[PDB]
Design a protein around this ligand. Structure first.
Ligand SMILES: O=P(O)(O)O[C@H]1O[C@H](CO)[C@@H](O)[C@H](O)[C@H]1O
Ligand SMILES: O=P(O)(O)O[C@H]1O[C@H](CO)[C@@H](O)[C@H](O)[C@H]1O
Ligand SMILES: [Mg+2]
Ligand SMILES: [Mg+2]
Lengths: 199, 199
C-alpha cells in the first residue's frame, strides 16, 4: 500500500533564517537591523509574490517602500540571496528511504525565490530526495489554500487517506486537515524522526 | 596578566562552505557542480584578492576565466553571496568571556569578501565579540606571512609570549609559531572548547 508523503520545505527540510537577509540590508544601508526587523511584515506582497501574481521587481519594490530601503533591485536580490539555509540531513535520509520503499515523496513550498537567486528548492540534495517539487509560484496557488493540496492529490493520483503531510505552520495543517489529509504539525526537529521511528 | 587571543574566522568562529556558491553558479549556467568543483583552485588570484592587490572585478574575471563561467560581475557576486556560513556560538561565548576577564580578543582573517557582499566578518555577532577585526584586504597582507602577525602584535601592543592564536590551517600555525606565538591548530569544533575548559 503505497503512500503519498508531502513535506513542507522551510523549517521542515531546511532550517531557514531571514535575519541574515535583514543583516545584509542593514550593513549596506546602515539602517539598524532592529528597525528592519520591526518593519519586515508578511502581507499582501508576500501572498502575491508566493502565488506568482507580482514580479520579483514588484515584490522588491513593495518591501523596499514598506521598510524605507533605498536599494536597487540588484542590492535587494543580493541581500535576499544571503538568507541562512541549513539542510536537516535526517529528513533527507528519511525521504530517500521512503522512496526506496516505493512510497511517493513530494515537497510543497510557498516560495519567495527570485529569478536571480539560488533557493533551497533548487538545491541538488533536495531535488535528489523528492519525486516532485510543488512550488506556489509555479502553481499560482499557496498553502493553506484548499486548491493547492487538491492540485497535489490530483497530480500524484492519491486519495487524502493515502496522504501524509508535514508542515510547521498550523494554518497549513488545518487547510490540509479539512480535505481529510493526515497532517502532522512539525513542532521542532524531533517531530519527523519521532514519527518515522515510532511506527 | 592580560593576554592577546587571535582567532581565525573561517572554520574556527564560523563553519563556511563554498560548495553552496558553486551550486548557485551551477544552477545559473547549467555547468555541472562537479566540473566547477574540479576547476575551483586557490591560486594567485585568491592570494592577490585576499591582500587587496586586485579588484573584486579582476578577481571575478580570473575565476570566471579559469572555470569557464559565462557570468556577469553581478551574477558572480550573487553566487558568492550564497556561501554557507554558520556561527559556532560556543566560540562567540568564549570570546565574550575572555573580554569580560580583561583579555584582548581579535579576529584575523584572509578575506575574499566583495564590496557587494555581506560577509562573516561583518556579522554583528562577530563584531560584538571582538576588540578588533584584522582583515587581509585592509592590511595588504595575508596569513601565513610573518608581517601580518607582526602587524597585529604591534597594533595591539603584545609580545609573542603573551599571545595565543587559533587557526585551522597548518601553514598559518607554522607562520605564527616562527615568531614565538603560542599557536593552536584547530582540528575540529572540540579544539577551542577543550582548550578553555581544560585549564
Ligand atoms: O516557505 P515554505 O517552504 O512553505 O515554509 C516556510 O515558510 C516560512 C518562511 O520561510 C517559515 O517560517 C515556515 O515555518 C516554513 O514552513
Ligand atoms: O579565510 P580565513 O578566515 O582566514 O579562514 C578560512 O579560509 C578557508 C576558506 O574559507 C578555510 O577553509 C580555512 O579553513 C579557514 O580558516
Ligand atoms: Mg535559481
Ligand atoms: Mg559588506
Amino acid at each position: 500500500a503505497k503512500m503519498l508523503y508531502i513535506f513542507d520545505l522551510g523549517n521542515v527540510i531546511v532550517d531557514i533564517d531571514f535575519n541574515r537577509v535583514l543583516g545584509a540590508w542593514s550593513d549596506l544601508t546602515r539602517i539598524p537591523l532592529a528597525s528592519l526587523k520591526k518593519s519586515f511584515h508578511m502581507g499582501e506582497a508576500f501572498h502575491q509574490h508566493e502565488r506568482g501574481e507580482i514580479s520579483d521587481e514588484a515584490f522588491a519594490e513593495a518591501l523596499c517602500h514598506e521598510m524605507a530601503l533605498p536599494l536597487s533591485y540588484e542590492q535587494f536580490s543580493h541581500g535576499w540571496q544571503a538568507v541562512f539555509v541549513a539542510l536537516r540531513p535526517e529528513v533527507i535520509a528519511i525521504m530517500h528511504k521512503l522512496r526506496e520503499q516505493g512510497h511517493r515523496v513530494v515537497v510543497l513550498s510557498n516560495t519567495n525565490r527570485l529569478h536571480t537567486t539560488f533557493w533551497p528548492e533548487e538545491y541538488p540534495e533536495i531535488r535528489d530526495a523528492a519525486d516532485h517539487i510543488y512550488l506556489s509560484q509555479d502553481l499560482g496557488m499557496r498553502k493553506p489554500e484548499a486548491r493547492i493540496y487538491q492540485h497535489v492529490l490530483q497530480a500524484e493520483g492519491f486519495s487524502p487517506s493515502d496522504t501524509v503531510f508535514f508542515d510547521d505552520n498550523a494554518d497549513n495543517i488545518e487547510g490540509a486537515n479539512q480535505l481529510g489529509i493526515t497532517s502532522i504539525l512539525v513542532k521542532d526537529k524531533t517531530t519527523i524522526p519521532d514519527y518515522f521511528a515510532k511506527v
